[PDB]
Design a protein around this ligand. Sequence first.
Ligand SMILES: *[C@@H]1O[C@H](CO[C@H]2O[C@@H](C)[C@@H](O)[C@@H](O)[C@@H]2O)[C@@H](O[C@@H]2O[C@H](CO)[C@@H](O[C@@H]3O[C@H](CO)[C@@H](O)[C@H](O)[C@@H]3O)[C@H](O)[C@H]2NC(C)=O)[C@H](O)[C@H]1NC(C)=O
Ligand SMILES: *[C@@H]1O[C@H](CO[C@H]2O[C@@H](C)[C@@H](O)[C@@H](O)[C@@H]2O)[C@@H](O[C@@H]2O[C@H](CO)[C@@H](O[C@@H]3O[C@H](CO)[C@@H](O)[C@H](O)[C@@H]3O)[C@H](O)[C@H]2NC(C)=O)[C@H](O)[C@H]1NC(C)=O
Ligand SMILES: *[C@@H]1O[C@H](CO[C@H]2O[C@@H](C)[C@@H](O)[C@@H](O)[C@@H]2O)[C@@H](O[C@@H]2O[C@H](CO)[C@@H](O[C@@H]3O[C@H](CO)[C@@H](O)[C@H](O)[C@@H]3O)[C@H](O)[C@H]2NC(C)=O)[C@H](O)[C@H]1NC(C)=O
Ligand SMILES: *[C@@H]1O[C@H](CO[C@H]2O[C@@H](C)[C@@H](O)[C@@H](O)[C@@H]2O)[C@@H](O[C@@H]2O[C@H](CO)[C@@H](O[C@@H]3O[C@H](CO)[C@@H](O)[C@H](O)[C@@H]3O)[C@H](O)[C@H]2NC(C)=O)[C@H](O)[C@H]1NC(C)=O
Ligand SMILES: *[C@@H]1O[C@H](CO)[C@@H](O[C@@H]2O[C@H](CO)[C@@H](O)[C@H](O)[C@H]2NC(C)=O)[C@H](O)[C@H]1NC(C)=O
Ligand SMILES: *[C@@H]1O[C@H](CO)[C@@H](O[C@@H]2O[C@H](CO)[C@@H](O)[C@H](O)[C@H]2NC(C)=O)[C@H](O)[C@H]1NC(C)=O
Ligand SMILES: *[C@@H]1O[C@H](CO)[C@@H](O[C@@H]2O[C@H](CO)[C@@H](O)[C@H](O)[C@H]2NC(C)=O)[C@H](O)[C@H]1NC(C)=O
Ligand SMILES: *[C@@H]1O[C@H](CO)[C@@H](O[C@@H]2O[C@H](CO)[C@@H](O)[C@H](O)[C@H]2NC(C)=O)[C@H](O)[C@H]1NC(C)=O
Ligand SMILES: *[C@@H]1O[C@H](CO)[C@@H](O[C@@H]2O[C@H](CO)[C@@H](O)[C@H](O)[C@H]2NC(C)=O)[C@H](O)[C@H]1NC(C)=O
Ligand SMILES: *[C@@H]1O[C@H](CO)[C@@H](O[C@@H]2O[C@H](CO)[C@@H](O)[C@H](O)[C@H]2NC(C)=O)[C@H](O)[C@H]1NC(C)=O
Ligand SMILES: *[C@@H]1O[C@H](CO)[C@@H](O[C@@H]2O[C@H](CO)[C@@H](O)[C@H](O)[C@H]2NC(C)=O)[C@H](O)[C@H]1NC(C)=O
Ligand SMILES: CC(=O)N[C@H]1[C@H]([C@H](O)[C@H](O)CO)OC(C(=O)O)=C[C@@H]1O
Ligand SMILES: CC(=O)N[C@H]1[C@H]([C@H](O)[C@H](O)CO)OC(C(=O)O)=C[C@@H]1O
Ligand SMILES: CC(=O)N[C@H]1[C@H]([C@H](O)[C@H](O)CO)OC(C(=O)O)=C[C@@H]1O
Ligand SMILES: CC(=O)N[C@H]1[C@H]([C@H](O)[C@H](O)CO)OC(C(=O)O)=C[C@@H]1O
Ligand SMILES: [Ca+2]
Ligand SMILES: [Ca+2]
Ligand SMILES: [Ca+2]
Ligand SMILES: [Ca+2]
Lengths: 388, 388, 388, 388
Amino acid sequence: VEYRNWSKPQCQITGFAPFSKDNSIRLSAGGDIWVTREPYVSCDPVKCYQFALGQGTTLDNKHSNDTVHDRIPHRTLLMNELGVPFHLGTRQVCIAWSSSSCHDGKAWLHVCITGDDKNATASFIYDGRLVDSIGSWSQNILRTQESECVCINGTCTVVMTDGSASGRADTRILFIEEGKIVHISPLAGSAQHVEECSCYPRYPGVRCICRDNWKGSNRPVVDINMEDYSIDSSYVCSGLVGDTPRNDDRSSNSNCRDPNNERGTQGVKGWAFDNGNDLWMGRTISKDLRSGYETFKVIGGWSTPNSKSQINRQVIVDSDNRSGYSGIFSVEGKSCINRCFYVELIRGRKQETRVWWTSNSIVVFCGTSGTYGTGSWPDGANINFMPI
Amino acid sequence: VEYRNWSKPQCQITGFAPFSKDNSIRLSAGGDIWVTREPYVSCDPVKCYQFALGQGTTLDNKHSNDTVHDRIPHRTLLMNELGVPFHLGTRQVCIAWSSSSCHDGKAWLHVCITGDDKNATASFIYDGRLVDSIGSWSQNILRTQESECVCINGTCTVVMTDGSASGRADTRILFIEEGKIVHISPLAGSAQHVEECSCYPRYPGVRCICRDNWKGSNRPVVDINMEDYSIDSSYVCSGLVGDTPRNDDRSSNSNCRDPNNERGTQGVKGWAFDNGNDLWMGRTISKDLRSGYETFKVIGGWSTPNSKSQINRQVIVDSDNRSGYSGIFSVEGKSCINRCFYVELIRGRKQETRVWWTSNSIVVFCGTSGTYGTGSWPDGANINFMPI
Amino acid sequence: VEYRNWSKPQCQITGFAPFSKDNSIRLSAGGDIWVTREPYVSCDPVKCYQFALGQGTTLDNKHSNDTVHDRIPHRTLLMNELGVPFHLGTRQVCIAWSSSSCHDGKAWLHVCITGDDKNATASFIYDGRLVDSIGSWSQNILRTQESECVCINGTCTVVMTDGSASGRADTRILFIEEGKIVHISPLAGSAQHVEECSCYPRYPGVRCICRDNWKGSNRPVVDINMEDYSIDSSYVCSGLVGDTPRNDDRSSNSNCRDPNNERGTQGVKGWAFDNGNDLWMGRTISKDLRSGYETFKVIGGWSTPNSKSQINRQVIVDSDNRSGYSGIFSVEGKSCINRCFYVELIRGRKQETRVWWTSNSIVVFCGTSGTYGTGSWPDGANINFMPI
Amino acid sequence: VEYRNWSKPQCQITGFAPFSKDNSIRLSAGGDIWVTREPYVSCDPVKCYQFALGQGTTLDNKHSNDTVHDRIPHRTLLMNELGVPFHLGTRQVCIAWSSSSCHDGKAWLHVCITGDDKNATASFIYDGRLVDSIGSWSQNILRTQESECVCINGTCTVVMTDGSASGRADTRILFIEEGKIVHISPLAGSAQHVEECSCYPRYPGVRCICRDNWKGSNRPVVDINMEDYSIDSSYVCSGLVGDTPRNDDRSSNSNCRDPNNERGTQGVKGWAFDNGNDLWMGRTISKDLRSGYETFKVIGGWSTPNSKSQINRQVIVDSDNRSGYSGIFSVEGKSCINRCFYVELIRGRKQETRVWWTSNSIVVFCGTSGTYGTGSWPDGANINFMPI
Ligand SMILES: *[C@@H]1O[C@H](CO[C@H]2O[C@@H](C)[C@@H](O)[C@@H](O)[C@@H]2O)[C@@H](O[C@@H]2O[C@H](CO)[C@@H](O[C@@H]3O[C@H](CO)[C@@H](O)[C@H](O)[C@@H]3O)[C@H](O)[C@H]2NC(C)=O)[C@H](O)[C@H]1NC(C)=O
Ligand SMILES: *[C@@H]1O[C@H](CO[C@H]2O[C@@H](C)[C@@H](O)[C@@H](O)[C@@H]2O)[C@@H](O[C@@H]2O[C@H](CO)[C@@H](O[C@@H]3O[C@H](CO)[C@@H](O)[C@H](O)[C@@H]3O)[C@H](O)[C@H]2NC(C)=O)[C@H](O)[C@H]1NC(C)=O
Ligand SMILES: *[C@@H]1O[C@H](CO[C@H]2O[C@@H](C)[C@@H](O)[C@@H](O)[C@@H]2O)[C@@H](O[C@@H]2O[C@H](CO)[C@@H](O[C@@H]3O[C@H](CO)[C@@H](O)[C@H](O)[C@@H]3O)[C@H](O)[C@H]2NC(C)=O)[C@H](O)[C@H]1NC(C)=O
Ligand SMILES: *[C@@H]1O[C@H](CO[C@H]2O[C@@H](C)[C@@H](O)[C@@H](O)[C@@H]2O)[C@@H](O[C@@H]2O[C@H](CO)[C@@H](O[C@@H]3O[C@H](CO)[C@@H](O)[C@H](O)[C@@H]3O)[C@H](O)[C@H]2NC(C)=O)[C@H](O)[C@H]1NC(C)=O
Ligand SMILES: *[C@@H]1O[C@H](CO)[C@@H](O[C@@H]2O[C@H](CO)[C@@H](O)[C@H](O)[C@H]2NC(C)=O)[C@H](O)[C@H]1NC(C)=O
Ligand SMILES: *[C@@H]1O[C@H](CO)[C@@H](O[C@@H]2O[C@H](CO)[C@@H](O)[C@H](O)[C@H]2NC(C)=O)[C@H](O)[C@H]1NC(C)=O
Ligand SMILES: *[C@@H]1O[C@H](CO)[C@@H](O[C@@H]2O[C@H](CO)[C@@H](O)[C@H](O)[C@H]2NC(C)=O)[C@H](O)[C@H]1NC(C)=O
Ligand SMILES: *[C@@H]1O[C@H](CO)[C@@H](O[C@@H]2O[C@H](CO)[C@@H](O)[C@H](O)[C@H]2NC(C)=O)[C@H](O)[C@H]1NC(C)=O
Ligand SMILES: *[C@@H]1O[C@H](CO)[C@@H](O[C@@H]2O[C@H](CO)[C@@H](O)[C@H](O)[C@H]2NC(C)=O)[C@H](O)[C@H]1NC(C)=O
Ligand SMILES: *[C@@H]1O[C@H](CO)[C@@H](O[C@@H]2O[C@H](CO)[C@@H](O)[C@H](O)[C@H]2NC(C)=O)[C@H](O)[C@H]1NC(C)=O
Ligand SMILES: *[C@@H]1O[C@H](CO)[C@@H](O[C@@H]2O[C@H](CO)[C@@H](O)[C@H](O)[C@H]2NC(C)=O)[C@H](O)[C@H]1NC(C)=O
Ligand SMILES: CC(=O)N[C@H]1[C@H]([C@H](O)[C@H](O)CO)OC(C(=O)O)=C[C@@H]1O
Ligand SMILES: CC(=O)N[C@H]1[C@H]([C@H](O)[C@H](O)CO)OC(C(=O)O)=C[C@@H]1O
Ligand SMILES: CC(=O)N[C@H]1[C@H]([C@H](O)[C@H](O)CO)OC(C(=O)O)=C[C@@H]1O
Ligand SMILES: CC(=O)N[C@H]1[C@H]([C@H](O)[C@H](O)CO)OC(C(=O)O)=C[C@@H]1O
Ligand SMILES: [Ca+2]
Ligand SMILES: [Ca+2]
Ligand SMILES: [Ca+2]
Ligand SMILES: [Ca+2]
C-alpha cells in the first residue's frame, strides 16, 4: 500500500444524495443494541465504517438509565462497517469518551481519550498497537474532534483542546506519523474557541470548521499547513450562520474575523466546506434546539462577510424531529474527492423523558453532481414503544 | 479481475433442483430477525448473496405493527450471504424502498431509491462509494426492478419506471458504467406497462420479463441491446400466462404483441426465460391470490402465440400456502450459464390477521440438466406461535 | 490450489485426545441456538467446520415442539467453524434432511437431500453453485452418509442408499468430480444393509464402516476403489461389535462375512477404522440405548473373526449420560493423516420428556500418538433449567 | 511468513496508557454473554485477541448458578478479537479448564487442559489440528500458565505444574515446535512453588514471574534458556512484594532467593518485568482480597533485595472495586517491544452474593514512553441490576 496524499480536485456537487441509514433506535426495542452518542463515519480505501462512543451498555439494560453523561470510565470507541448497527458482536477499539480516527492509506489510527476531567490521558493507537499517549495540558477535560482526522503523505493531523467549555481554552494541533506525535503546533489567528472540528483535506492542506462554545454563533475556521505545521484560524463569512443556539436569519452576522457574539455560548458539532467562494453548509433547522436539519449553498459565503443569499437547500431531517451533532467525511473517486456528511439523530433524556437512557442513530448523505429529489429521513422510533 | 461479458451458452435445464431456504419467519418467533419484503438474490463471481428491503425493524418489535406499506423513510437494502438470515449483524447497504444490484465482475453496484413518491431520488452506489443519482422524472413513485440488474463488459443496465401504477407510465432503461449513468434509452415496442423486470443476460444482450400492472395478464418482454442502447418490448406468447390476477387456463390468451386485457390491472413480480422456442416459466398456482407456486415448460411458448401445451411442471410451494414475488438470477458454470429463481413466501397482514406485521422468507431453486423429484417447500411458520 | 490425494501413512495413534466441545444445549437455555441433529465435522485444508441438519428453528421457539422427526421441508444443512455454535448468524448452506460434505482440496462439495420420501431429489452443490442432482431410484427415502465424503485427485465418492430401512435396499456409490456425477457403481460383496457410512481415505482408496439397520449388529464394511469404481462389502471381524442394539460382550459374534443376525434390526451411525490387523472403534457403552460412549482397540479385530481381546479403552461420555450418532473425519499432518471422531450428544424427546423439542450438541476427539488421561465430557445441560 | 525471534530491545516505558476495556459484566444484563474467568490477551503479528475459559454457558442462563468452580467438563477456551466481547458467535477453540496460547509468527498454538484432577490430559493443538498431548505426571490437577506462552525461532516454551496447590509440586517446562513436544526440562533453582507464570521474551530467552501458592508472598522468577533448555528460578527482589495475601509495606521482605514465608499460602496470578535493575510491577492494592489495582516502578527492585523505593505508581482500578488475576503480554514495535498487561475484574459469588454466578470482564493497559494522566477503570456493573 501507499499513504494517501488526497491530491485530486474536489468534485463539483449539486447537493447531496442519501447514502446510509442505520435505524439503531428502532431496532433497540427488539434487539440488544449499544447505547451510543457522538458518532462519526470514515473510510479506509476500500470501504466505510461507522464509529460512535458507546456507553458501556446496551439499550434494554438497567445500566442504560442515566446515560445523559458524556464522561464515564466505560465509554469505548465502537467501530462497525457502514450500515451494520452496533450489536453485541461490535468491537470496542479502545477506551474513549472522546475520539477521532483516520486511515493514512496504510492503516487506521484512533486517538482515544479517557481519564479524570482534571487529568486525562489520550492514547494514540496505530495499526492495532498502542504507539504513544499524552496527558491533559490544561487540566480541564482534554477533548478531541469526535469525527475523522486527516492524513497526507503519512502524517495525520488531529486537533485537540483542553480548558474551559465556555471561556478561554487551549487548542493544539497534533501531527502524528504512524501513531507517533511528531509535532505539536498551537492555534493561531482570530478564532476564539475551538471545540470538535470537522476537518477535511484541501491538498496540500487540511481545513476545519468547528464549534465556538463560548462567544460564537458563527463557526471558527482552522487552517492547517502540513508543509510547516503552520496554523491559522478565522470564522466563516456567511451571515447565514450554522451553530445552535443561533440568532435568526435576519439578525445574524459574521465578518469572517471575530465571534459574532450573537448567542455564542453553547454549540453543537457541525460542518461546512467551501467551493470557490461558495459555502456548502448544514445545520439543525432550529436555532434554539437540535431539531430538523437542512443543508444549502450560500453563494459568496466563503469570501464575502455577512453573505446570506442561499440556493440549493435540502431538508435531510424535517423541522419537527430530533437532530444533533454532525460532521464531514471525504471519500476519493476515480477523478475527484467527494464530501459527505452524517447527522446524529439523538433520542432519550433531556427532551424525551418517558425514558432514562440517551442514545442516537444516524443517517448519511454524500455530494452528488447529479439530480436528486426530496425527503426527510428521521430516526423514526415511536418513543412509547421503546424500553424503560 | 475482469468485467463479465457472460458469453457462453445457456445450460439445457431439465427442471429445477432445490438450492437454498432461509426460514426467517420460523426463527423470528425465537430470535431477533428483520421485517423484510421484496427480496432478491444475486451473486458475485465466487458466491451468492440474498437481498431484501427491510422495514427498519425486527419482527418482535412494537415498530413491526403496520409494516404493510411499501414506502417509509426507514426501508434500507439488506445484504447477506445466501443462507444466512437477516439477523442484527446484517448490513444495511443503503436507504432504499426500491432496489436492484448486480456485480460487473469487478465490484457490486446497487441502485437504491427513497424519497417522497412525488419527488424521490435514486442513488447509484458503486464499490462502496456514492457515484451518481437521479430524481423522479414523472413525479409519481420512481421505482426499479426489485431483483438483479445485469452487466456485460463493464456496463450495467437497470430499467426503471415512474408514473401511474394502473395507467400509462414512463419506463426508462439506464446504462451505468462504474456507478456513472452513461446513457438513458426510453422503452420502445408494444409493451403497455413495465414494472419490476426480471432480467437476465442473453449475450450479446439482456432480456427482461416484467409486470403489466395496468392492462396485462400476459407479461411484457423488454429486450435491451447493449451494442447501441436500442430497446424493444413485446409480450410472452404462451397462452398459459403468468401474472396474478390471471384469467383461467382455458380462457387466457396472448398474441405476443398486446396486453391481453384479461384481468390486466394489478400484478406481482415474476419471471420466465426462453430456450429455443420454449418458455421456462413460474407462477403462483392461484390466479386470484399469491398462493402456491408451480413451474413448467411451455412447448412453443416463446414463439407461437397462445401456445398452451406444457410439459415438466413442478410444485415448489403447494397450492394452499402463501407465495408472492419472484425473480430470475443467473450463475455462470464451467461451460454454460444456469438460470435460477427465488420466491418470496410472504406472511402477516392482508391475508393473515392474527398479526400486524408483514414480512416473508425465501426459497430458491436452480436449473438442473439432471434428475429430480417432488416436494413443496413452504414458509412453514405456525402463525399462532408467532409474536403479535 | 491442488486437489487432495491424501497420500501419506495413517498416523500411529495411542488413543484419542479431546479436541472441541460446543455446549449448544447448555447455551440454548440462555440464547437463540438452532435445533439440530445428525451433526458431522469436516475440514478444508486450513481449518475444520461443524455441520448439522437444523430443524428450521431455534430452541426457545414454539416451532421447536415436535422436532422428533427426521424429515420436514425446513431442515437445511448448517455450517460453522469448529467451535462456534449454531447461532442466528449461522448459514444454511442448502435445503437438506440428509447430507454429506467434503472438500476436494480446491472447494467444498455438499450433497443435500430433501423432498417427499417417495420421490426426493438430491442436489449436488459445488463451490457455491448447483452443479447436478438426482431423483430417488427406489422411491423410499433416498438418504446419504450424514458425515464427511472423501475425495482423491478431484473425485469425491459419496455413497447413498434408497429402499427399506429394515429390509433390502439399494445402495449406490457415487463418483462426483466438481459437482458432476461422473459415475455410479452399485454395492457389491456380502454386506446386507448399508446406511449412513462413516468413510475415510486409505490411499489409493476409500473405506467405509456403516450401519446395518436390518439384520446386523456387526458393522458392514464398504471398500471403494477409485481406480476403477469397483466396490466390495463385508463386515468387521471384531466379536466385540459396535451397533446398538448390540447383543452382549460374551454373546456377540462376527465372522467378517455375514450380518451376525444378533439383534440386527435398528442401529445408529458409528465408525471404526483399521490399523494393521487392529481395529480402533467406538460405541455407546449401552447395547440397548444410546448412552455413554467408550472407545478401544481390538487386537486382531480387523483380520480375525470374533476377536474380542481389547486394549486401550477410553470413556468419552460416561455410561449414564446420552450418546447418539458418531462418525470419523481425517485431518492431514506434516507427515501422516490422523483420524478423529465426533459424537452426537442428543437431548429432548424420546428419552427426556419434560420437553417437546429434540436437539443435541457435540464433542470431538482426535487420535494422538502421545499420552492422555481420563474424563467424561457429556452434554451437561440440566434438563429442568431448559425451555418448554 | 517467518517465525518470531523477538530480537529488538524492550521499549523504555514511562508508565501505562489505557488500551482496551470490554464491559462484559455490564452488557450481560442486556444481552447473551459468556460466563468466563481466568482471561488473558495475546496477539498474532497483525492484531490482538482476548481469551478466557468460559463456563459452558451464558450469564442469563440457569446453568450459570454455581460457576464458582474452576473445573468442569464444559470449560472451553474462548478466543475473540481484542475488544469484541464473548457473545454467542464466539468460538470455543478447544475443551480446556486451564490454558495458554501464543503465535510462533506463523500460526497459533493453544495448550488446553481438561480431565479428572487425578488424571487429566493436555492437548497441544497447532494451526487448527491436534498435534500432541500429555497426561498428568503427578496425578494432582495438571495446570498451566493461564496467559500467553512465548516462542522464538519456532519453539514455544510453555511451563506447567502438577502436584499440591499448597505444598510441593512438579513444575516442568515444555518446549513445543509446531504442536510437537520436542523437549521437557524440570524446574531448577530456588523457587518453592510455581503456578500460573506470566512470561515474556528477553532475547535470547524467556522470563517468567509466577505465583507461589505455598510459602511465598514474594513472586518466583523462572528463567528459561532456549539455547539449551536450561532453567533457573529465584524470587523478585523488591521488598514491596506483589502476591495477595501480602504482608504489609513496612513488614514485607524478599532476599531474591527464598519464599519470604510471609503469608505465603494462597495467591493470585500476577506479573512484573524488569528494566535495568528496576522492576515494573502490578498488584491488587489490597493485601487481603483482590480489590483495586495499582502499578509502579521499584527503583532497584530487580537487583537489590528488599528494595522498597517506588516511583511512577498508577491506579488502574480504585481500591474499593474488584480486581483479580492479571498477566503480561508483549507486542512488537517498529523499533522495540512493548509490554502490556490485562486485569481480570471478577464479579459474582464469593464476595458478591446477590447472585449465584461468577464471571468477570477485563481492562488492558500498555507501556508508553509518553505522558499520561489519571483514572480508575473498574467493571462498573450495578450488581443489583444484574440477573439472578
Ligand atoms: C432511573 O434512575 C433514577 C436514579 O437512578 C439511580 O438510583 C440509584 C439509587 C442507583 O441505584 C443508580 O444505579 C441508579 O441508576 C431512579 O429514580 C427514582 O424513581 C422513583 C419513582 O417513583 C422516585 O420516587 C419518588 O418518591 C415518591 C414515591 O416513592 C414520589 O412521591 C416522588 O414523586 C418520586 O416518584 C425516586 O425519586 C427516583 N430517584 C431519583 C433520584 O430521581 C429511577 O427509578 C430509575 N429507574 C428507571 C426505570 O429508570
Ligand atoms: C397495532 O396497530 C393499531 C394501530 O397502531 C398505531 O396506533 C397509533 C395510535 C400510533 O401509536 C402508531 O404507532 C401505532 O402503530 C392498534 O389498533 C388499536 O387496537 C384496539 C384493540 O382493542 C382498538 O380499540 C377499539 O375500541 C373498542 C375497545 O377499545 C372496541 O369496541 C373496538 O372494537 C376496537 O377494538 C383500536 O381501534 C385500534 N386502533 C385502530 C386504528 O385500529 C393496535 O392495537 C396495535 N397493536 C398491536 C398489538 O398490533
Ligand atoms: C406441544 O405439542 C403438542 C402437540 O402440538 C401440536 O398441536 C397442534 C394442535 C398444532 O397447533 C401444532 O403446531 C402443535 O405443534 C401439544 O399437546 C397438547 O397438550 C395438552 C396439555 O394439557 C393436552 O390436553 C389433554 O386434555 C386434558 C386437559 O385438556 C387432560 O386430561 C389430558 O390428560 C391432556 O393433557 C393435549 O392432549 C396435547 N395434545 C396432544 C396431541 O398431545 C402441547 O401442548 C404442545 N405444547 C408444548 C408447550 O409443548
Ligand atoms: C442456585 O443454587 C442453589 C443450589 O443449586 C443446585 O440445586 C440442585 C438441586 C440442582 O438442581 C443444581 O442444578 C442446582 O444448580 C439453590 O439453592 C436453594 O435455594 C432455596 C432458597 O429458598 C433454599 O431453601 C432453604 O429452605 C427454607 C425455604 O425452603 C429456608 O428456611 C432456608 O433458609 C433455605 O432458604 C435451598 O436451601 C437452596 N439449596 C442450597 C443447597 O443452598 C438456588 O435456589 C439456586 N437458584 C438460584 C436462583 O440461584
Ligand atoms: C507528498 O508526497 C509527494 C511525494 O511524491 C510530494 O511531491 C514530490 O516531492 C518533492 C517536492 O517537490 C519532489 O520529489 C516531487 O517533484 C514532488 N511532486 C510530486 C508530484 O511527487 C508532495 O508534495 C507531498 N506533499 C506534501 C504536502 O508534502
Ligand atoms: C468473455 O470473457 C472471457 C474471459 O475473459 C473471454 O475468454 C477468452 O475467450 C477467447 C474467445 O472468445 C479466447 O481466445 C481466450 O483464450 C479466453 N480467455 C479466458 C480468460 O478464458 C472471452 O473472450 C470473452 N468473450 C468474448 C466474446 O470476447
Ligand atoms: C465485450 O468485449 C469484448 C472485448 O474482448 C468484445 O469483443 C471484441 O471486441 C472487438 C469487436 O469485434 C474486437 O477487438 C474482437 O474481435 C471482439 N471479439 C472478441 C472475442 O473479443 C465483445 O464483442 C464485447 N461485447 C459487446 C456486446 O460489446
Ligand atoms: C499427492 O500430493 C502431493 C502434493 O501435491 C504430492 O507431493 C509430491 O510428491 C512427489 C512424490 O510422490 C514428490 O516428487 C514432490 O516433490 C511432492 N510435491 C509436493 C508439492 O509436495 C504427491 O506427489 C501426491 N502423491 C502422489 C502419490 O502422487
Ligand atoms: C493421483 O494423481 C497422481 C498424479 O500425479 C497419480 O500418480 C501419477 O499418475 C501416473 C500413473 O502412474 C504417473 O504420471 C505417475 O507416475 C504417478 N505417480 C505419481 C507419484 O504422481 C496417482 O496415482 C493418482 N492416484 C490415483 C488413485 O489415481
Ligand atoms: C529476527 O528476525 C528479523 C526478521 O526476520 C531478522 O531481521 C534481519 O536482521 C539482520 C540482523 O540481525 C539483518 O541483516 C536483516 O537485514 C534483517 N531482516 C529483516 C527481514 O528485517 C533478524 O535477523 C532476526 N534476528 C536475529 C538476531 O537473527
Ligand atoms: C534464531 O535464529 C537465527 C537465525 O538467523 C539465529 O542467528 C543465526 O544463527 C547462527 C548462530 O550464530 C548463524 O547462522 C548467524 O550468525 C546467527 N545470527 C543471526 C543474526 O542470524 C539466532 O541466534 C537464533 N536465536 C536463538 C536463541 O537460537
Ligand atoms: C468531551 C466532551 O465532554 N464532549 C461533550 C460536549 C462538551 O461538553 C462541550 O464541548 C463543552 O466543552 O457536549 C456534548 C453535548 O451535550 O453536546 C457532548 C460531548 O460529549
Ligand atoms: C415501489 C413500490 O411501491 N413497489 C410496490 C408494488 C407497487 O405498488 C406496484 O408496482 C404499483 O405500481 O406493489 C407491491 C405489492 O403489494 O406487491 C409491493 C412493492 O413494494
Ligand atoms: C434419512 C433419515 O431419515 N435418517 C434417519 C435414520 C433413518 O430413519 C434410518 O436410517 C432408517 O433407514 O434414523 C434416525 C434415528 O433416529 O437415528 C435419524 C436419521 O435422520
Ligand atoms: C487449574 C486451576 O484449578 N486453577 C485455579 C487456581 C488454582 O486453584 C490454584 O492454582 C491452586 O493450585 O485458583 C483460582 C482462583 O480462585 O484464583 C482459579 C484457577 O482456575
Ligand atoms: Ca456557540
Ligand atoms: Ca396485470
Ligand atoms: Ca442393526
Ligand atoms: Ca502465596
